[PDB]
Amino acid sequence: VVLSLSTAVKELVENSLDAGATNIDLKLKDYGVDLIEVSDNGCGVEEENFEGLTLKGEALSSLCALSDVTISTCHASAKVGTRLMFDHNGKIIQKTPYPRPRGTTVSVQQLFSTLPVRHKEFQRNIKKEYAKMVQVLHAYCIISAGIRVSCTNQLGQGKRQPVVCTGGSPSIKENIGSVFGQKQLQSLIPFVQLPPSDSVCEEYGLSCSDALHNLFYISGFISQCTHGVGRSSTDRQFFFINRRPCDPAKVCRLVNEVYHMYNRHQYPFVVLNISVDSECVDINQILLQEEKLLLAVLKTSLIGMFD
Numbered sequence: 006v007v008l009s010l011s012t013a014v015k016e017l018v019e020n021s022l023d024a025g026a027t028n029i030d031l032k033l034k035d036y037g038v039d040l041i042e043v044s045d046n047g048c049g050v051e052e053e054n055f056e057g058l059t060l061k062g063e064a065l066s067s068l069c070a071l072s073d074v075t076i077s078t079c080h081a082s083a084k085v086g087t088r089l090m091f092d093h094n095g096k097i098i099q100k101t102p103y104p105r106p107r108g109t110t111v112s113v114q115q116l117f118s119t120l121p122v123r124h125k126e127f128q129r130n131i132k133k134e135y136a137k138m139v140q141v142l143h144a145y146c147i148i149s150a151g152i153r154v155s156c157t158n159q160l161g162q163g164k165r166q167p168v169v170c171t172g173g174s175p176s177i178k179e180n181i182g183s184v185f186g187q188k189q190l191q192s193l194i195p196f197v198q199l200p201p202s203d204s205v206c207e208e209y210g211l212s213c214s215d216a217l218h219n220l221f222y223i224s225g226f227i228s229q230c231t232h233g234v235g236r237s238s239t240d241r242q243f244f245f246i247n248r249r250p251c252d253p254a255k256v257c258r259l260v261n262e263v264y265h266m267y268n269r270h271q272y273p274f275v276v277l278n279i280s281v282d283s284e285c286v287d288i289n290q291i292l293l294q295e296e297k298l299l300l301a302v303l304k305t306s307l308i309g310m311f312d
């Protein structure tokens with residue numbers, strides 16, 4: 006799964022999160038076309054697993070096949086950090102001692118250079134590819150409370166441009182502020198979950214028995230129903246299932262729709278996390294075992310907030 010620029014950065018960012026990082030700094034050159042560097046203060050890597058970094062689903066090895074990967078890392082238990090250079094077959098070319106703080110820094114140089122067709126497509130469509138990355142990055146930024154995530158992009162030898170930056174704030178609300186400015190917050194109301202209404206249940210084919218296994222816990226923010234306050238498109242709508250950025254099609258349609266019942270010419274800003282038992286999530290598209298109930302809960306709740 007190194008099929009787009011966004012999927013390459015998401016994979017890297019997730020690695021940092023899983024490593025328990027509280028600081029994740031992403032450096033990009035030429036919109037990532039020349040360099041995508043992710044620096045974190047997570048747990049780092051132990052020497053026993055160096056040879057196992059590009060091996061054993063498993064996109065670190067992929068990145069080596071598609072680009073020149075350099076990794077510096079240091080575990081708490083380590084006396085000294087290490088700098089590693091990998092060839093495209095995921096083999097360690099070089100290995101040298103390197104004093105550095107605990108954490109890992111992964112450098113992806115000349116992404117797709119080994120696939121000349123894909124590499125040029127990536128350059129021509131850079132705008133769209135970059136835009137998509139930025140969306141993914143904003144998601145992880147918003148939901149990652151307590152974690153400082155920063156990103157800069159540098160074009161040519163020009164100055165490093167700011168892309169996004171969070172302050173390690175404890176709430177999602179604060180992250181939204183960091184990412185989009187304090188003016189966006191001001192046109193948002195917090196999500197308030199309500200039991201599914203009798204009428205909304207009626208239209209979904211739900212009954213008194215269908216509504217007790219409700220295990221859905223929803224939280225987040227949405228733009229008010231006030232005239233003008235909305236957006237001009239769906240460019241700022243982020244959905245998450247158990248803190249993981251995803252795209253539940255039906256949930257998205259419902260949200261944008263209930264909003265339109267109040268604001269006809271605008272799309273709302275959306276940040277919604279769907280907390281669920283992980284055993285009720287499938288992959289195939291996403292299947293949530295009780296979608297009707299969730300949809301019911303969503304609509305009821307949105308209706309109650311907007312009135």
Ligand SMILES: Nc1ncnc2c1ncn2[C@@H]1O[C@H](COP(=O)(O)OP(=O)(O)OP(O)(O)=S)[C@@H](O)[C@H]1O
Pocket residue numbers: 016020021023024045047048049050058062063064065066108109
């Ligand atoms: N930032 C990091 N800090 C510490 N270890 C890392 C970091 N990035 C990668 N690794 C290590 O490299 C191995 C991982 O990655 P894969 O991306 O190849 O890993 P996965 O972590 O098993 O991820 P999936 O399958 O994408 S969910 C991991 O098991 C980690 O031990």
Ligand SMILES: [Mg+2]
Pocket residue numbers: 016019020064
């Ligand atoms: Mg991974």
